[PDB]
Design a protein around this ligand. Structure first.
Ligand SMILES: *[C@@H]1O[C@H](CO)[C@@H](O)[C@H](O)[C@H]1NC(C)=O
Ligand SMILES: *[C@@H]1O[C@H](CO)[C@@H](O)[C@H](O)[C@H]1NC(C)=O
Ligand SMILES: *[C@@H]1O[C@H](CO)[C@@H](O)[C@H](O)[C@H]1NC(C)=O
Ligand SMILES: *[C@@H]1O[C@H](CO)[C@@H](O)[C@H](O)[C@H]1NC(C)=O
Ligand SMILES: *[C@@H]1O[C@H](CO)[C@@H](O)[C@H](O)[C@H]1NC(C)=O
Ligand SMILES: *[C@@H]1O[C@H](CO)[C@@H](O)[C@H](O)[C@H]1NC(C)=O
Ligand SMILES: [Ca+2]
Ligand SMILES: [Ca+2]
Lengths: 288, 288
């Protein structure tokens, strides 16, 4: 996976066509001087612009894009799909792709939808048309077929940096995403900060247990780590002893990655009441 | 103040009469071998027993006591009254000492009463008879007079380690006690962990601001510090910069005391979801 955000703001791969099939080539960011976004407005490489023509998302749009009057287009990047975004699917009406429950909200975000469905004990949450939230446990949310991820790019009504599906198009998420806690026993998975992909709420204490029977060690990486405060903190505890193995906060970041020689770890997050930020994504991989 | 707990479990002063006036002298704990409590059952000085006859509370009774068939008695120790316990007062009925609101609860504790009143925006909370909670903003809760603190020693129905008043006797607390947050501007005050004097709840994030216009420094001491986990933590932040000045947790305790050369500090507490403990009491004293 090359993206651990919902809008691929963290994408830093080398796709430079709007689509791998039938796409247009991207312009170079160090020559797009007519346009708002180019390397001269953003020295220091902010949002990943540089001396290339690779798809990027520097302005908080819903997906990566590039300059190509249609002077820019979204890129359809298959590897850029955060873990837990299960895809964009067609919704032909009756029955719907998820059959559990639904609501509409003028402030819908991915997480407010996810959160609504999770509450009600549903496995899957789907957003359509920017404002409609569908929940379900149905395994066959793909019933009407997959759609290009670009057909799910309506802005969420509550957050314009986030995609919320489309007309007859539903963007699907596992409701574990951004839960405040959870048990993980898979060989490898990703854990997101609470409320992800919204910024994390103030005053959260959340922990997740990672227990992989038979592991000799577990490898941790933090492909996303955007925690604001010395007071916000992410901690890994030894599961058996509760000893704090590592403490990360806004002023002491994680190495690319590191290994813990345990089969049982507890990841804790504490959020203060000062400033919120995008949060984190931790990828763990157990090794036998 | 010689006690920062509600039952004086932390009292370590030298009173060895049950009362300073008309009292009986206490027996020595290193010769009370008939009794459950003595220095041979508790080597390592637990609950402050040693080679003395000083009032102590090693068994989680509601107040300090000593051996003197009435073979033991509570001690009436004027200095042992935690900051925010405003005293024990007479209640002669109509009108009551606090006139705001009331409830009864089979699980009453000091904090559940305090919490109920605070919620409703009352300054004062009072417990009577072990089970009755009274709230009020009335300044004259002392209207019927003070009583010996020993007349307020009914066990709280929800916590037998805590006093909850008596028949016609009300024990009074400032509702700031154990609040999850607050602003302090006094020259000196005490801040307690959340839910104090109950053990702190799991999953709390609380902060209190101490801002004393014109202070050159603020002196902090921790006369009580009973935090269980490496994962629970108390932190002091610079108010202007939010820099974490000191981090204390279950495995790294505070010095007797220390000074911060600021007029503006934020005290933060984070409580994990593993084990709770009695909590803390921080005494600050600003200096000009
Ligand atoms: C895409 O970028 C690569 C550099 O990674 C470059 O070799 C190639 O010229 C690019 N293709 C197009 C059409 O820009
Ligand atoms: C921008 O950078 C590319 C890749 O190095 C370079 O080939 C190109 O000529 C540059 N264009 C300008 C206007 O700097
Ligand atoms: C972590 O785990 C693997 C063994 O599975 C090891 O080969 C690799 O070098 C380790 N990485 C670090 C940073 O220790
Ligand atoms: C009280 O204890 C003090 C020691 O601090 C001792 O001098 C004195 O003998 C005691 N008085 C009584 C009656 O025990
Ligand atoms: C206990 O300690 C006191 C104070 O030191 C001492 O005077 C007394 O004789 C001791 N009694 C016994 C039985 O050890
Ligand atoms: C703290 O403050 C006072 C000045 O008000 C100073 O005299 C005292 O020595 C200080 N204590 C510590 C531990 O610095
Ligand atoms: Ca924060
Ligand atoms: Ca704890």
């Amino acid at each position: 996976p090359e993206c651990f955000t919902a809008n691929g703001a963290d994408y830093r791969g080398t796709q430079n066509w709007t689509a791998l099939q039938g796409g247009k080539p991207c312009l170079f960011w160090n020559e797009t001087f007519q346009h708002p976004y180019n390397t001269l407005k953003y020295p220091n490489g902010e949002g990943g612009l540089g001396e290339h023509n690779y798809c990027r998302n520097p302005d908080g749009d819903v997906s990566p894009w590039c300059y190509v009057g249609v002077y820019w287009k979204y890129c359809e990047i298959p590897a850029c799909q955060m873990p837990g975004n299960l895809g964009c699917y067609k919704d032909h009406g009756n029955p719907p792709p998820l059959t559990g429950t639904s609501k509409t909200s003028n402030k819908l975000t991915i997480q407010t939808c996810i959160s609504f469905c999770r509450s009600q004990r549903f496995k899957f949450a789907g957003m359509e048309s920017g404002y409609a939230c569908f929940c379900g446990n149905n395994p066959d949310y793909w019933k009407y077929g997959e759609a290009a991820s670009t057909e799910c790019n309506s802005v969420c009504f509550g957050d314009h940096t986030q995609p919320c599906g489309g007309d007859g198009r539903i963007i699907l998420f596992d409701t574990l995403v951004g839960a405040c806690g959870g048990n993980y026993s898979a060989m490898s998975s990703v854990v997101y900060s609470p409320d992800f992909p919204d910024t994390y709420a103030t005053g959260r204490v959340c922990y997740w247990t990672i227990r992989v029977p038979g592991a000799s060690h577990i490898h941790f990486s933090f492909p996303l780590f955007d925690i604001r405060d010395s007071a916000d903190m992410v901690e890994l505890l030894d599961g058996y002893t509760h000893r704090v193995l590592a403490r990360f906060h806004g002023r002491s970041r994680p190495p690319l990655s590191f290994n813990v020689s345990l089969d049982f770890v507890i990841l804790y997050f504490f959020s203060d009441r000062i400033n919120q930020a995008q949060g984190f994504a931790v990828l763990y991989q157990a090794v036998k």
